[PDB]
């Protein structure tokens, strides 16, 4: 809660300035994000075979159609046809990956835990992701949602005092670190920053970060990815050459990583959402429901990605199945309507994420552009130097 209670007219003009479909109402402290799970009917937690098999076999068919189309004209295709096939395959794999992320939290087919764990491992493998490290990081996210200095497995924002500290530690903005930060948080490569998250899994490939009674499970978790990049990745190259690798593997990879990064970045970032450190005003239900955003999709994309944008219906109910995530949302707006936040697909939203909302300041408790912030903390350096000439 940052731009909390004031007339709804200015929050609506803010929502139109930012492309947001709504801005939340006031939320009082002392609540549990599991509370509002008592509202949903006792049939929203139901199990059925047809919906799940559709959710797994539809993006599969998308990917298969894209591959068949490509292998039909393997490398004689032009550039934008290649881009179309890459986007289609990456979207199908994002859907399959959401099925994976479902069976990782044990809420896909609880009837067969072994079969569902094997399915999650198999479907995470082609993206080079270990199932148990993913599960640990996602629970560690849920526990610290929107907490400062604590949720590093989400989109932890870069704050002001730390950037001034690095400014002094590098001796100006001309070092490698400052230039890297600028170039990564200013250009559309930010929309692919999830790649860096993939390099923060494999926690140094170090079992000293885990609980001993889990070692044999963590290593097997690092096995299915490695084995893949040890067996299949060669074969492809062997049978396709360098170009034949940049086509059938790397581009769908960048597509899936784009989808992942933008989903998360738009789900938990907004100027009307503050990032408090706990002790200095944090709360579970507040930073859960009030500091969140839900995005809108075309129903084709929603049946492809398998409800990949409904993150709150399963943050109030961690055991809510996947084919019921829209329906549950239907109930939630009926109850917490004024406090919800919503948004849609718009290149304007992404452009504001790229150019406007770049640095988080805790004084105004909101996001600011990076060049203005950098010139102004250079001005504060001028200030402290003026206090230092004598």
């Amino acid at each position: 809660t940052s731009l909390d209670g004031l007339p709804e007219t200015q929050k609506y003009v803010y929502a139109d300035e930012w492309g947001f479909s709504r801005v939340g109402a006031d939320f009082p402290p002392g609540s549990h994000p599991s509370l509002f799970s008592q509202l949903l009917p006792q049939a929203l937690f139901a199990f059925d075979a047809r919906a799940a098999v559709a959710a797994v076999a539809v993006p599969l068919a998308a990917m298969a159609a894209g591959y068949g189309w490509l292998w039909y004209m393997h490398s004689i295709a032009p550039v934008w046809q290649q881009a179309l096939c890459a986007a289609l395959i990456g979207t199908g794999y994002a859907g399959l990956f959401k099925v994976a992320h479902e069976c990782a939290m044990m809420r896909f087919i609880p009837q067969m835990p072994g079969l569902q764990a094997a399915l999650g491992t198999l479907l995470m493998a082609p993206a080079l992701y270990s199932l148990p490290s993913w599960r640990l990081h996602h629970l560690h996210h849920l526990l610290h949602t929107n907490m400062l200095w604590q949720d590093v497995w989400g989109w932890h924002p870069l704050t002001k005092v730390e950037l001034a500290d690095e400014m002094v530690r590098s001796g100006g903005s001309g070092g490698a670190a400052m230039a890297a930060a600028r170039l990564v948080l200013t250009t559309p490569i930010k929309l692919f920053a999830s790649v860096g998250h993939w390099l923060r899994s494999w926690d140094g490939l170090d079992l000293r970060h885990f609980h001993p009674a889990s070692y044999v499970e963590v290593l097997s978790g690092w096995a299915a990815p490695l084995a893949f990049a040890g067996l299949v990745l060669p074969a492809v190259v062997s049978a396709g050459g360098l170009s034949g690798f940049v086509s059938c593997y790397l581009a769908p990879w960048l597509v899936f990583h784009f989808w992942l990064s933008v989903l998360s970045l738009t789900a938990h970032t907004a100027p009307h959402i503050p990032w408090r450190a706990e002790g200095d005003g944090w709360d579970a239900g507040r930073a859960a429901v009030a500091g969140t955003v839900t995005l809108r999709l075309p129903r084709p994309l929603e049946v492809l990605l398998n409800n990949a944008n409904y993150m709150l219906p399963q943050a109030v109910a961690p055991g809510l199945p996947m084919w019921s995530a829209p329906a549950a949302y239907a109930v939630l707006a009926a109850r917490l309507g004024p406090y919800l936040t919503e948004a849609s697909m718009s290149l304007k939203l992404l452009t504001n994420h790229v150019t406007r909302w770049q640095i988080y300041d805790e004084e105004a408790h909101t996001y600011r552009p990076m060049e203005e912030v950098v010139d102004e903390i250079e001005a504060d350096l001028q200030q402290l130097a003026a206090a230092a000439q004598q």
Binding site: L136, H140, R208, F210, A213
Partner: peptide, 17 residues
Amino acid sequence: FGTYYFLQKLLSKYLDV
């Protein structure tokens, strides 16, 4: 180091009831 000892401990206690 030992940065997931506690979370895994509690998760094991609760999911294996």
